[model samples]
Target: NYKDLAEALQNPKEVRILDLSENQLTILPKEIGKLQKLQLLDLSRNRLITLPKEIERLQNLLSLDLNENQLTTLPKEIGKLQKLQELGLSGNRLITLPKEIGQLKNLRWLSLKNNTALIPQKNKIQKLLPNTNID
Candidate 1:
C-alpha cells in the first residue's frame, strides 16, 4: 500500500490526522506540505483539482476538510494557514478565491455551501473574511 497514503505519509514528524477521504485523489504531492503536525485535513470525497504549494506548510492547520472536491481555485499559499480555524468549502467546484483568502487571520469558519459560482463571491468574500462565518 505504498502510495495508498504512502504509509501515512512516511512519518512527517508526528502526523496529526490526514484522512484523505474517498482517495480517488487527483492531485496533492508537494510532499503534502511535509505535514508539519497537521491539525485536521480530511480532503473530503477526493478528486481534488488543486492544492500543493506545499499547502503553505500546514503551520499547525486547524481544520481544512474541503468537502466534495474539484476545486477551481484557492492557493495564495492559503494565506500560510496561520492557525487556520475551519474551511470546509462544501461540495466544491469553486470559481475563485485567493486574495490570499484575506490572510486567514485565524479564520473562524467558512463552509461556502455549494459553489454556485462561489455563491456570487459572497459579497466579495465578506470583505476579505472580516471575521469569517460565510456559511
Candidate 2:
C-alpha cells in the first residue's frame, strides 16, 4: 500500500523535507501539492514512472533529488518554483525536458548525468537550464 505523503503534508505543520528514496513508488499522490513548506524532497532510487502535476505545489522547494528513477517527463509548472536552487535528475529515463523549464530563474545547479537520452539535446538543454553548473 502507498503511504500518502501528501495527505500528511496538508497538516500545515509537518517535516519541511521528505525522503522517499529507495522505495517502490510508482506515482506520487495528487495530494502532494499541499506541502506548502517543503524545502527539500528526495525521491531517489524509486520506481516512479511519472510525477504528478501537483508537485508544482512545492513552491518553497530548494532541492529535488530524482536519481535512479523511471521518470520520462517533468511537469511544466516546475518553472513556478521561484526559490528552487538545485534539481537532481540523474539516472532517470527522461528523453525531453519541458520548454517551460527555461523559466526557472533561480535554479543554480542541475544534474542529469545518467540520462543517455538527454545527450542529443545537450545544447538545447544548456540554453534552457542556463544554470551556474550542470552535470
Candidate 3:
C-alpha cells in the first residue's frame, strides 16, 4: 500500500523507522529530511522515478532500502548517510550510480544484483569507499 509520505514528513522528530515499501510512490517530498532521528527507511517496490536530494538530512540513518522500485537514478546525497550500513538497491532502473556513494564509509553490505542498468564502474565505485563491500 502506498502511503502519503508527505503527510508524515512533518514532526519528523518522533519518527525512527519509516517503511514505505511495496507502494506506488512516484516521488518523495523534500520534507522527508525533517526526520532527523530516522534510522531506517524503506522505499522499495514503488514507482519512484528518482530520489529527492533532501534525503541527505537523514544524518542518523543506518539502513536504507530502495529495492524493487522504479528509480532510474539515485540522488548524490545518498552518500551523506554517514552512518548507513546496509543499502538495498536491487530491482531498480538505475543506469548510473552517483559518485558520492563511496562517501558512506560505514556501508557494510549492498545489493544491486537484479538491475541490468547498473553497469559496475569499479573505479568510480571504489573511489567512494576503498574497503567497503558494496556488491
Candidate 4:
C-alpha cells in the first residue's frame, strides 16, 4: 500500500505515458502533479471516487482514460488541460459536468457512456463543443 507514488516517478520529467489501470486504487497520490511531461494517463477499472485538484499540473496531457470508476464529479480545473484531445469517462456516477469543459478547444472526443445523470444534460454538453464526438 504505497501511498506516495513520487518514489515511482523517479523519471517524472521525461515520462510521457503511464498506465495504472485495474490497480483497484481508491486514491491517487498528490505527487502525481510532478509528471509535467505526461501525455497519456490510463487509470481505468479502478476504485477512484475523486481526483486531486493537483491533477491539473499535467499540462501536457493529451489523452486521459478513467473508464469504469466511481467518479461523481470532475474538477473544474480539468479544463486546464488545453492540449487534451480525448477523455474517457465511461461507466461513472457523474451527474453533471462543469461548463469549463468548453475551454478544451483541442478536444476531439469525450466518452460518457452509462452516466445516466448526464443523459438529460447531453444537449447542453453537446452545445459546448459541437465538433467533438460525445458518446
**lDDT top scorer:** 4
TM-score of each: 0.34, 0.89, 0.86, 0.93
Error of 3 at 65 (Å): 0.4
RMSD of each: 10.4, 2.9, 2.7, 2.9
- The residue-by-residue lDDT of candidate 2 on 21-123, one tens digit each, is 7767888777777777878888888888778887888888898888889989988877888888888889899988888888888888998988889999999
* Global Cα lDDT for candidate 1: 0.83
Model 2 regions more than 4 Å off? 1-7, 10-12
Q: lDDT tens digits, residues 1-135, model 3?
A: 114465566556888888887767888878888888988888888888888999899999999898888878988998888999999888888888887887888998888767776656655665656776766
TM-score attained by model 3: 0.86
Candidate 2, residue 94: how far the Cα is off, in Å: 0.6
**Structure candidate 3, residue pairs in collision:** 102-128
Ranking by lDDT: 4, 1, 2, 3
Which 10 residues in a row give candidate 3 its minimum summed lDDT? 1-10
Off by over 4 Å in 3: 1-7, 120-128
Highest TM-score: which candidate? Answer: 4
How would you encode candidate 1's per-residue C-alpha lDDT over 27-89 as one tens digit per residue?
A: 978887777887888878888987978888889989988888988887789988899999897
Q: What is the lDDT of residue 97 in candidate 4?
A: 87
The window of 10 residues in a row where model 1 has the poorest summed lDDT is 1-10
Candidate scoring better on TM-score of 1 and 2: 2
